[PDB]
Amino acid sequence: YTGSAIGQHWMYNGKHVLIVFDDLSKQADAYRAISLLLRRPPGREAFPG
């Protein structure tokens, strides 16, 4: 989201941006860790809904 905001600032100013997320699997794992540490009931593969 930080990278996306940095890119969006340019994009909304008429610039062209290329953003690479290397990688979103680890972001999903981190978000699952945060959700579980908040005791949110998990779903498929222990991920939050």
């Binding site: 005791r39 009931p41 998990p42 593969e45 222990a46």
Partner: protein, 48 residues
């Protein structure tokens, strides 16, 4: 000669099938562990 070629092909196909079935079985094993933990933790949370 044709039998040798066909049996080599069949052995290769059986190896590929074994690999795919092992991958699917491991996915199922992990999913079963995850679902069992989900049910156990849901019960524990309900009794919390």
């Amino acid at each position: 000669a044709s039998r040798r070629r066909a049996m080599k092909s069949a052995t290769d196909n059986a190896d590929d099938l074994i690999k795919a079935l092992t991958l699917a079985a491991n996915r199922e094993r992990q999913a079963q562990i995850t679902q069992e933990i989900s049910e156990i933790v849901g019960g524990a949370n309900a009794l919390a």
